[PDB]
Amino acid sequence: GMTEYKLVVVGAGDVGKSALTIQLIQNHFVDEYDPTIEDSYRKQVVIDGETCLLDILDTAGQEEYSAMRDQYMRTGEGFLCVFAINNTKSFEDIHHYREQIKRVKDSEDVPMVLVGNKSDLPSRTVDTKQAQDLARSYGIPFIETSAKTRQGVDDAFYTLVREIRKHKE
């Protein structure tokens, strides 16, 4: 049958989680998407010749560390940890998201990709080298994206699928 991959997009508000997701789903850039909407979206894609079903949870809202929300996040098989290259705070929040993922999955080995979004913008405040070095510290890939131009979008999601596949084995 067709394998379904449950991917979860996390990161500070305003980094482009929704815009990245909608680029993948609609093949269209949105400059506006209600910041409070957390929802999941499915798409069939071919990755390495295999048609698979992506189920992408675009997270939103305030922190909630209930048992219910933990159990829900635990259903995620891989995580995109997104920051914006023009927002230092969003980069400095990455460790929080990574630590929450390690906690809820009870594993130091969770499929994950670090995503530096808004690569089309001139206002960079986070050096590429620093982001690459953080991904190296975590042992995960780093992908530079733009939801506006589509730079890196397939690479980010497809890399995460490839990481999930390898983790199963």
- Closer to ligand GDP at the Cβ: 13 or 50? 13
Nearest of 160, 43, 147 to residue 101 by alpha carbon: 160
Please report whether residue 61 would count as binding ligand GDP according to CB under 6 A: no
Please report whether residue 126 would count as binding ligand GDP according to CB under 6 A: no
Please report whether residue 18 would count as binding Mg ion according to CB under 5 A: yes
List, as own/partner pairs, every contact residues 149-157 make where C-beta atoms lie below 8 angstroms and the sequence separation is at least 24, other chains included.
149/29, 149/119, 149/120, 150/23, 150/29, 151/119, 151/120, 152/115, 152/119, 153/20, 153/23, 153/24, 154/24, 156/20, 156/80, 156/113, 156/115, 157/7, 157/24, 157/45, 157/54, 157/56, 157/80
Interatomic CA distance for residues 91 and 82, integer angstroms:
8
Please report whether residue 31 would count as binding ligand GDP according to CB under 6 A: yes
Binding residue for ligand VU6, selected from 97, 138, 157, 158, defined by CB under 6 A = 97
- Closer to ligand VU6 at the Cβ: 59 or 119? 59
- Closer to ligand VU6 at the Cβ: 71 or 149? 71
169, interface contact from Mg ion, ligand VU6, ligand GDP, none, CB < 5-8 Å by kind: none
Interatomic CA distance for residues 122 and 99, integer angstroms:
30
Please report whether residue 86 would count as binding ligand GDP according to CB under 6 A: no
By CB under 6 A, name the binding residues for ligand GDP. Answer: 13-19, 31, 33, 35, 117-118, 120-121, 146-148
Name the site residues for Mg ion (rule: CB under 5 A): 17-18, 60
